[PDB]
Amino acid sequence: PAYRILKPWWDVFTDYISIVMLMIAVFGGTLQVTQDKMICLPCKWVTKDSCNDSTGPTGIKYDLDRHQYNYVDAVCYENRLHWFAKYFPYLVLLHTLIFLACSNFWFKFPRTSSKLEHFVSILLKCFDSPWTTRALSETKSRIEQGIVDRSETGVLDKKEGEQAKALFEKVKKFRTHVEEGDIVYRLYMRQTIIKVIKFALIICYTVYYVHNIKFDVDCTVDIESLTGYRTYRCAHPLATLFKILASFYISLVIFYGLICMYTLWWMLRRSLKKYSFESIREESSYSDIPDVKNDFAFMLHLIDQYDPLYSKRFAVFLSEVSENKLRQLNLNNEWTLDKLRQRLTKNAQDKLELHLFMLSGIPDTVFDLVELEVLKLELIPDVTIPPSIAQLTGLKELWLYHTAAKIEAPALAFLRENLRALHIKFTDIKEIPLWIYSLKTLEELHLTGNLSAENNRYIVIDGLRELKRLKVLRLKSNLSKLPQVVTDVGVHLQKLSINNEGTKLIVLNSLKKMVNLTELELIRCDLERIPHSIFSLHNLQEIDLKDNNLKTIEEIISFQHLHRLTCLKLWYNHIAYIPIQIGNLTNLERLYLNRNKIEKIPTQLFYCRKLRYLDLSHNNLTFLPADIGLLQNLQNLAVTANRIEALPPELFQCRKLRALHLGNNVLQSLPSRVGELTNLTQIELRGNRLECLPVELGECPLLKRSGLVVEEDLFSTLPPEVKERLWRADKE
Amino acid sequence: PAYRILKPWWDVFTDYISIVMLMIAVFGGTLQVTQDKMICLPCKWVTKDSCNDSTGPTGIKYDLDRHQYNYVDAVCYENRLHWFAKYFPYLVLLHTLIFLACSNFWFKFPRTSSKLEHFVSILLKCFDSPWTTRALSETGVLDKKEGEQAKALFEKVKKFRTHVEEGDIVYRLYMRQTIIKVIKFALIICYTVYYVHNIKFDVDCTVDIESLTGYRTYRCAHPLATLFKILASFYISLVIFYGLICMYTLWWMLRRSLKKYSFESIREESSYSDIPDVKNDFAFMLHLIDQYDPLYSKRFAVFLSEVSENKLRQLNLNNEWTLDKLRQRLTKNAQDKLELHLFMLSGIPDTVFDLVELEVLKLELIPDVTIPPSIAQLTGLKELWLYHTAAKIEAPALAFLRENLRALHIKFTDIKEIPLWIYSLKTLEELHLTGNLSAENNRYIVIDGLRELKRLKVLRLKSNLSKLPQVVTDVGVHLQKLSINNEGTKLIVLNSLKKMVNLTELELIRCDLERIPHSIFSLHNLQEIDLKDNNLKTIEEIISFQHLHRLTCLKLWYNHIAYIPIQIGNLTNLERLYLNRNKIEKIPTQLFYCRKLRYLDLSHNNLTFLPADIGLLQNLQNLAVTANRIEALPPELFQCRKLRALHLGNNVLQSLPSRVGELTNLTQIELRGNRLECLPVELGECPLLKRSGLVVEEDLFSTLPPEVKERLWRADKE
């Protein structure tokens, strides 16, 4: 079968020399059995216990019948013929049989036969794998930007990829099962040593004894009482042929010994317990191929001796870069177009979103979508953006959550002319792609992750100057100081949102250069004090100082400079009181002050006649001044988690009030003037000292059962007409 | 095994000859084993150790018992019989064994066995390739799977040629084997024919044992001598034939220099000139196969070539894209033209050149493509887009394009991706360049041939220009429309544009001018000026636009413009004036002196009010003040009856004035996001306004009368 690849040439040679030696052994045996005789004639005159060897001549007479001659032949053949002449073929047969048993012991020893057959089968199926040919088929300024070189990959069938993956798993399991044993190498070493020592023995003693095969043998067999003679001279007819065969056999054994000594030299000097693969990975440039341990590098040295081709065809299949390539090619087939189409969702801005969580790479079937809007790559390793991304004409936002993604020049150009918003989340600078600064159409940047550096502070983001069309910028990076490059690029910024997640920040007179800024958020900057520089921004419209540990906010008087400021948010702080000067803030449309230490609402706050939103929940409020009816523009009001006990009737003067959040209060009785409010749509009642719902609550034109949040104990008190109408309206 | 094709005729003849020689060796060996004796009789009368040989006859009596005859036979046979008479069959057997070992040494030697088995494995399936028969019949429809098989077999052939040609081992073995065969044939003719005479029927032995038998010399008969002589003559005749064949093979192997294969007849007949001659150890296997059959070598050359590779790739691509599936992907572009988009293909499919209705072609990431001369089959084609596609062209196709190409969209990631033959055209009108082309000490050398465009009229240089190129200046003496987009890179002109007096439309988008240059005032024939996204804080320089007597449309949007200079009143000819995305806070009344105004868009600004003078612009058709702080609409807005669409969303509008129904021409109005309460009933008297043109929420649409809802839904239906 395939076992022919195991044997090197020095084993074929000893498989054929063994056959030839066995052939001559069989010939010698079948000659010595049916043909070998000894023709003996007595010597009449004996000199020194030896044959003297000293009318036409007449033949001598011995007066011996034929059977006497046969008997003396038998006796002299048994006694005075050297055993190496009689038993040469049997010795040759025995030595060749033990040579053969030494050469083929491991193939029949079941401890190593299973290992060898498994190895040869797996190497064969790794030689015929169509992935193996494909793997070898592939053979400053730009370099530092993370722009990878163009690379083009094909397709593999689903079944073919499954077979390749299964073969990879089987190869790894076999490698674990085999690299630990080290039984085959020991057996091969023992076999070679035994062959060498046996060659030494049977090339020494055979040459020692080969001189005893003589044609003429003198025997003194000491039988007079049977034949009457003392000594005989005999001819061994097959002595010369046996000598020739013995010389031929010792020549064959000499060649066998030379080849076995070559085998011992090759197996000893190399120290082949480890295979390096130093040629293939220096030729094809596939570094990730580990060196091999015991019991597996010898099985590969034998194969290399048979043919180096299988060594490459297995080393490539044993690499990990190939495994990553196969993983990509299987992942591409794994995700159908429709399965990713169904995976699409809707984001906050009502776009089509695809969130790839925990994938080995980007399934290149995503770039066959035309309707994708936001792509989110979270926890993807060292991925590279292919140039196929240009198919995504609708791509607008790219999210890089812990993915140091590289790109190619065409895809980089396409993003450079189409990308709008980029979301960056990282743990270190290396996870930030450095090619973002070539994106000259980006507008929104979301840098998440610490970036302040020691002795090289604020050097990575120096490319922000290149992003000319940057408008929005959100930084959540535990900043201890405003970076200079951000300050410089703020000259055309139209929004900022910093978030030090509790870290203290010092503006240190730097925010004044962002003359185009309109919205400014400083969340968890631990300011504890509004800097005056914020009031130097003559274009601001949205100021948020969430969780700055603010206590006194009387600086809001300077907000008089801002002549277009509408929305203000100082929620989630320790604001003890609302300063009266807020009444001067005429332009306000929304005001959020929840989650504060606020106790009372001063009346001056109701001079903001354009106010529309008022969120004063989770404070120390105990009542509501009657001026609430002045703000006829009000449409929302939340007083959740307060000590409000009686609702003032004037509250119901604002007819276009669309909501009321009366949760977690001490309201004893809900005023019946609620039916006055024609524009009420969502009113929350859970958490009050209420006992019955006034009927007028149920006559709101658009309020429905779902829109009414209340305990079922209170809802049970509604008139049945009200319950029926609310449920019927809710059902449609 | 399938190695039968690797044996030439002489190898089969030598195998048969060796089998016959082995057979006669076995026969002469068993005969020598079972019967070869000597029959000796002593000579009574001896003359000089020889037999003198000098009433019915009576037999002579030697007085020798049978065993003494056996002993003398053994002694004479051992000593006075020539070794060649005894050991002839064993020598024949040894010579045949070593001949067979020489013959089959390269098959059993693993180093050269692997190469032969791999070569025959590849060649058998190359002969079996379903594409070989088609290609050689052509000297068509094919399955995709068999195309992949053909591609894989091309890969295997390339790898095989890479591996094999380095070897030079099979040739060395097949040389040394024949050398050894020839020398051993010479030796075993030399010694044999010399020694063949020693086989004699009768011999005379003076074995000199008198003490045992009593005689001096004996005459013996060798019964097998005649038969052994016959077999010796037969064996030497066979050896002579063997040597003749071996010397013939040596001469044949030393005639043509088998280390190199010419490979010229097949390439000369089948028109595949891209077949380089194979190196050592690969010419030899082809030579042996040719000795068996040239057909396999011819069926292997098709895969060995390069033209066949490209043709197979083209056939695979053609099978990939059918004509009807190609038509299914045909679409229409924005410019009201028929366009075909090709993205990331190996080459240009040959099937695209049948849809003559195609007008615009786009090539996006299609590497190493040569434009066939068959594009003349497409005459309705008018635009070719080369998107990162460095495409080579042929003389007939280029000559055809020189008279059939008006617009050529070019996008390049590098200079060499720009075709050098684009300027060779002469009927071209529109050229779009998209890519950085700046260089240091070799600045703007790529577009030097731009002067050859004697017909160019439309240009668009989105090329990251830090300066206005000099070749553009030289060529602009005939241009009409110029578009420039620097992607935010500052543009430097500095008196390098005014040579272009034939211009009519000029666009400087994202050039970061920060200030209108005076040179534009030289362009007297200019009619449409755009300065989008130039960080323009003030636009006072437009006062100089009095020179331009046909300025109709002016756009200054996406800037930081603070105010509208009143001098804009002098620009009476303005028809469409875009100023959205600006820091403008108020509208001077002088802007209303331009009564010819038809489009006025002022969205995304700092506006708070609308002047009553807006009724003076009776020619106004579309007005947009979206995303502003406009409190209420003045009734003078409705003085301009021909208003067809208003954009009023994202504002602080409280209620809609009732004069809305007065404007019959009003076909659209946008009001989403405004603090609106109830729509006026006059919305029911709008003649051509429909639901699609009424951009408003359904919760406010509920306020509209059901008659108005009926009319709106009826208009929406038809």
Beta carbons of B484 and A464 less than 8 angstroms apart: no
Interface of A with B in 126-145 (CB under 8 A): 130, 133-134, 136-137
Tell me the C-alpha to C-alpha distance, in Å, between residue A247 and each of A88, A206, A243, A568, B705.
Answer: 11, 9, 6, 114, 126
CA distance B708 to B534: 46
Task: State how far residue B86 is from chain A, nearest Cα, in angstroms.
Answer: 10
CB contact under 8 A, B211 and A468: no
Instruction: Indicate the residue of B110, B214, B343 with minimum beta-carbon distance to A60.
Output: B214
Q: Which residues in chain A have Cβ-Cβ distances shorter than 8 Å to B60?
A: none
- Residue B136: name the closest of B352, B295, B292, B262 by CA: B295
* Number of CB atoms found within 10 A of residue A74's CB: 13
A183 touches chain B (CB under 8 A): no
Pairing of strands A682-684, A708-709: parallel
Interface test with A, best of B96, B144, B212 (most A CBs within 10 A): B212
Instruction: Indicate the residue of B66, B75, B156 with minimum beta-carbon distance to A133.
Output: B156
Residue B533: DSSP 8-state = S
What are the DSSP calls for A260-278, one per residue?
A: HHHHHHHHHHS-TTS---T
> What contacts B104, CB < 8 A, 6 or more positions away?
none
The terminus-to-terminus CA distance of chain B in angstroms comes to: 81
A491 touches chain B (CB under 8 A): no
CB contact under 8 A, A41 and B211: no
Angle between helices B170-195 and B110-127 (to 10 degrees): 120
Residue A447, beta-bridge partner list: A424, A475
Q: After which residues is chain B broken (C to N over 2.5 A)?
A: 54, 139
CB contact under 8 A, B45 and A56: yes
- Residue B288: name the closest of B340, B312, B253, B263 by CA: B253
In this structure, what token pair is assigned to residue A430?
């290396």
Print the SS3 string covering A544-569. Answer: ECCCCCCCCCHHHHHHHHCCCCCEEE
Residue A6: closest CA among chain B residues belongs to which residue? B110
> What contacts A392, CB < 8 A, 6 or more positions away?
A366, A367, A369, A370, A372, A375
In this structure, what token pair is assigned to residue A527?
């300011």
- What b/e sequence results for B689-706 when a residue is b if at least 16 CB atoms lie within 10 Å of its CB, and e otherwise? bbbebbbbeeebeeebee
Could you identify the residue written with the tokens 């000796």? B40
Q: Which residues in chain A have Cβ-Cβ distances shorter than 8 Å to B533?
A: 469
> What contacts B317, CB < 8 A, 6 or more positions away?
B345, B346, B347, B349, B350
CA distance B179 to B202: 40
What are the DSSP calls for B72-108, one per residue?
A: HHHHHHHHSS-HHHHSHHHHHHHHHHHHHHHHTHHHH
CB contact under 8 A, A388 and B344: yes
CA distance A72 to A230: 11
Return the amino acid letter for A550.
L
B343 touches chain A (CB under 8 A): yes
In this structure, what token pair is assigned to residue B428?
């071209």
CB contact under 8 A, B212 and A20: no
* Number of CB atoms found within 10 A of residue A109's CB: 15
Q: How many CA atoms lie within 13 A of B379 on its CB side?
A: 0
Task: State how far residue A468 is from chain B, nearest Cα, in angstroms.
Answer: 6
Q: Which residues in chain B have Cβ-Cβ distances shorter than 8 Å to A8?
A: 110
Q: For chain B, what is the radius of gyration of the CA atoms?
A: 52
Residue B606: closest CA among chain A residues belongs to which residue? A564
Beta carbons of A214 and A242 less than 8 angstroms apart: no
Q: Which residues in chain A have Cβ-Cβ distances shorter than 8 Å to B510?
A: 468
Contacts A–B by Cβ distance under 8 A: 125
CB contact under 8 A, A12 and B62: no
CA distance A433 to A398: 12
Could you identify the residue written with the tokens 């390098």? B496
Pairing of strands A216-219, B553-555: unpaired
Pairing of strands B668-670, B694-695: parallel
> What contacts A103, CB < 8 A, 6 or more positions away?
A11, A14, A15, A18, A191, A195
> What contacts A119, CB < 8 A, 6 or more positions away?
A174, A178, A299
A659 touches chain B (CB under 8 A): no
Interface of A with B in 72-111 (CB under 8 A): none
A384 burial (CB, 10 Å; 0-12 / 13-18 / 19+) is middle
Method of elucidation: cryo-EM
Angle at A109 between CA A104 and CA A113, to 5 degrees: 90
CA distance B672 to B648: 8
Q: Which residues in chain B have Cβ-Cβ distances shorter than 8 Å to A20?
A: 97
> What contacts A390, CB < 8 A, 6 or more positions away?
A410, A411, A414, B343, B364, B365
- Residue A130: name the closest of A335, A288, A316 by CA: A316
Q: How many CA atoms lie within 13 A of A102 on its CB side?
A: 21
Task: State how far residue A571 is from chain B, nearest Cα, in angstroms.
Answer: 26
Task: State how far residue A76 is from chain B, nearest Cα, in angstroms.
Answer: 15
Helix intervals (H) in A82-155: 83-86, 88-103, 105-108, 110-127, 130-137
B334 touches chain A (CB under 8 A): no
Q: Which residues in chain A have Cβ-Cβ distances shorter than 8 Å to B388?
A: 387, 410, 413
Instruction: Indicate the residue of A54, A309, A416 with minimum beta-carbon distance to B163.
Output: A309
Give the phi and the psi of residue A690 in degrees, each rounded to 5: -100, 155
CA distance A63 to B65: 9
In this structure, what token pair is assigned to residue A195?
């062959």
Beta carbons of A247 and A210 less than 8 angstroms apart: yes
Beta carbons of B458 and B480 less than 8 angstroms apart: yes
A153 touches chain B (CB under 8 A): no
What are the DSSP calls for A50-94, one per residue?
A: EE--------------HHHHHHHHHHHHHHSS-HHHHSHHHHHHH
CB contact under 8 A, B78 and A137: no
Could you identify the residue written with the tokens 């030497």? B236
The helix (run of H) or strand (run of E) holding residue B474 is: helix B470-475
* Number of CB atoms found within 10 A of residue A421's CB: 17
Residue B199, beta-bridge partner list: none
Could you identify the residue written with the tokens 């003389």? B395
The helix (run of H) or strand (run of E) holding residue B150 is: helix B144-164
CA distance A33 to B491: 112
Angle at B527 between CA B524 and CA B531, to 5 degrees: 100
Interface test with A, best of B43, B49, B51, B67 (most A CBs within 10 A): B67
- Residue B130: name the closest of B116, B119, B144, B118 by CA: B144
Residue A534: DSSP 8-state = G
Beta carbons of A425 and A448 less than 8 angstroms apart: yes
B373 touches chain A (CB under 8 A): no
Give the phi and the psi of residue A172 in degrees, each rounded to 5: -65, -45
CB contact under 8 A, A133 and B110: no
3-state SS class at A476: strand
Residue B51: DSSP 8-state = B
Residue B452: DSSP 8-state = G
CB contact under 8 A, A59 and B214: yes
Residue A441: closest CA among chain B residues belongs to which residue? B487
In this structure, what token pair is assigned to residue A198?
């046996």
* Number of CB atoms found within 10 A of residue A566's CB: 18
- Residue B481: name the closest of B453, B500, B463, B496 by CA: B500
Angle at A296 between CA A290 and CA A301, to 5 degrees: 95
Angle at A196 between CA A191 and CA A200, to 5 degrees: 145
In A553-712, DSSP assigns E strands to: 567-569, 590-592, 613-615, 659-661, 682-684, 708-709
Q: Which residues in chain A have Cβ-Cβ distances shorter than 8 Å to B111?
A: 9, 307
Measured in residues, chain A has a length of 732
The terminus-to-terminus CA distance of chain A in angstroms comes to: 78
Residue A368: closest CA among chain B residues belongs to which residue? B343
Pairing of strands A345-346, A352-357: antiparallel
> What contacts A641, CB < 8 A, 6 or more positions away?
A617, A618, A619, A663, A664, A665, A687
Q: Which residues in chain A have Cβ-Cβ distances shorter than 8 Å to B42?
A: 59
Task: State how far residue B615 is from chain A, nearest Cα, in angstroms.
Answer: 29
Instruction: Indicate the residue of B62, B109, B365 with minimum beta-carbon distance to A387.
Output: B365
Residue B78: closest CA among chain A residues belongs to which residue? A237
In B24-181, DSSP assigns E strands to: 39-42
CB contact under 8 A, B211 and A66: no
Q: How far is CA B544 from the centre of its chain?
A: 58
In this structure, what token pair is assigned to residue B553?
């449309």
> What contacts A19, CB < 8 A, 6 or more positions away?
none
Tell me the C-alpha to C-alpha distance, in Å, between residue B678 and each of A80, B68, B626, B658, B681.
Answer: 141, 152, 20, 11, 9
- Residue B394: name the closest of B371, B369, B422 by CA: B371
Residue B409, beta-bridge partner list: B385, B432
Return the amino acid letter for B180.
I
CB contact under 8 A, B70 and A130: no
Resolution of the model in angstroms: 3.8
Could you identify the residue written with the tokens 């013995």? A246
Residue A289: DSSP 8-state = -
CA distance A324 to A320: 6
B621 burial (CB, 10 Å; 0-12 / 13-18 / 19+) is middle
Angle at B161 between CA B160 and CA B163, to 5 degrees: 65
CA distance A583 to A557: 9
Beta carbons of B41 and B219 less than 8 angstroms apart: yes
CA distance A173 to A727: 64
In this structure, what token pair is assigned to residue A706?
């779902």
Beta carbons of B510 and B485 less than 8 angstroms apart: yes
The helix (run of H) or strand (run of E) holding residue B645 is: strand B645-647
Tell me the C-alpha to C-alpha distance, in Å, between residue A92 and each of A34, A209, A214, B204, B622.
Answer: 18, 14, 19, 37, 115
> What contacts A104, CB < 8 A, 6 or more positions away?
none
CB contact under 8 A, B78 and A45: no
Q: How many CA atoms lie within 13 A of B424 on its CB side?
A: 14
- Residue A69: name the closest of A36, A35, A41, A45 by CA: A41
Task: State how far residue B62 is from chain A, nearest Cα, in angstroms.
Answer: 6
Query: With the C-alpha atoms ordered A111, A112, A114, A115, is the resulting torsion angle positive or negative?
Result: positive
- Residue A616: name the closest of A626, A630, A627, A602 by CA: A602
In this structure, what token pair is assigned to residue B423?
């300027």
In this structure, what token pair is assigned to residue B581?
């995305």
- Residue A685: name the closest of A724, A640, A620 by CA: A640
- Residue A521: name the closest of A498, A547, A489 by CA: A498
In this structure, what token pair is assigned to residue A586?
């005429």
Pairing of strands B553-555, A345-346: unpaired
Angle at A219 between CA A213 and CA A223, to 5 degrees: 145
Helix intervals (H) in B221-350: 225-253, 265-270, 283-292, 294-304, 307-320, 323-328
